[PDB]
């Protein structure tokens, strides 16, 4: 599925708007977040561990058989993490964090994991992206629906400083755990400001988002949220597009610090290549 991407069954399809999407549209020219509405992010996936039944990361549904996530969720040698297909399972259609949502959520097994060949875990998590092929296709519903991958023009017009995006996840609320899916809308920040906030070498395959100390507002992703989607609603065709993947950050919601995200469009050719061969 991908022709009906980005149009949510409970919102766009019914001409209903969620509580905070107007905030995103008005800007076009999880710590400190809030509870998500039912069906607000039908592409949100939970990367789950089979051994100690645990939440590992967020992820996103891009088609009936493909899930997108951060490569650090699967491979991060500094912490002795190197997961294979059989160590994990994905839970799609969820709202509650801990509860097995009977008749609503669907669980899938991984058939193959693809990590970007030039993923730089040794230094700055450059090219922090990974694809996962589901063993069997998932059926869409009111709570399960894929998000769109951006094209050159969508990336060009939407990826601008000041424009707000949305991050969702079941991660930590502070640097305990939420009962349900959290959501926070954050503005994209100027590259110079991103660079000047850290000693880490940032590349073109990343972008940072968040409020500046003087802006008053707060918000950020945190542990448990990584691998999750950073999405924006296009004001041209009303579809939701995934512009970033929650990558890294120095702490959570720290003043003067910003969350970093994998630049999905710049790595799109790798995505297409993988899906077109496997």
């Amino acid at each position: 599925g991908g022709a009906d991407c980005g149009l949510r069954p409970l919102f766009e399809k019914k001409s209903l708007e969620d509580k905070t999407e107007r905030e995103l549209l008005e800007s076009y020219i999880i710590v400190e977040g809030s509870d998500a509405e039912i069906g607000m992010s039908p592409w949100q996936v939970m990367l789950f561990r089979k051994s100690p039944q645990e939440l590992l990361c967020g992820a996103s549904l891009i088609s009936d058989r493909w899930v997108l996530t951060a490569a650090h969720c699967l491979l991060y040698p500094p912490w002795d993490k190197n997961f294979t297909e059989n160590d994990l399972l994905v839970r799609i259609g969820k709202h509650s964090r801990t509860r097995y949502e009977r008749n609503i959520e669907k669980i899938s097994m991984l058939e193959k994991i693809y990590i970007h060949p030039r993923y730089n875990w040794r230094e700055n998590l450059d090219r922090d992206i990974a694809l996962m092929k589901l063993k069997k296709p998932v059926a869409f519903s009111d709570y399960i629906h894929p998000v769109c991958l951006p094209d050159r023009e969508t990336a060009a017009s939407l990826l601008q400083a000041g424009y707000k995006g949305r991050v969702t996840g079941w991660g930590n609320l502070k640097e305990g755990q939420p009962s349900v899916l959290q959501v926070v809308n954050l503005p994209i920040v100027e590259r110079p400001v991103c660079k000047d906030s850290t000693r880490i070498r940032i590349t073109d395959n990343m972008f940072c988002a968040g409020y500046k100390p003087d802006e008053g507002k707060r918000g950020d992703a945190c542990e448990g949220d990584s691998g999750g989607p950073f999405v924006m609603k296009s004001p041209f065709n009303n579809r939701w597009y995934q512009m970033g993947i929650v990558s890294w950050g120095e702490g959570c919601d720290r003043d003067g610090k910003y969350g970093f995200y994998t630049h999905v469009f710049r790595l799109k050719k790798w995505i297409q290549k993988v899906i077109d061969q496997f």
């Binding site: 089979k50 039944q53 645990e54 939440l55 590992l56 990361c57 650090h72 969720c73 991060y76 912490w79 993490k81 399972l89 964090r97 801990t98 509860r99 097995y100 669907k106 669980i107 899938s108 097994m109 755990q177 992703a221 945190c222 542990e223 448990g224 990584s226 691998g227 890294w248 950050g249 120095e250 702490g251 959570c252």
Partner: peptide, 13 residues
């Protein structure tokens, strides 16, 4: 950064 659950019944794994 960097990277309570109810068990899952045998309806997948």
């Amino acid at each position: 950064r960097x990277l309570d659950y109810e068990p899952i019944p045998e309806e997948a794994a």
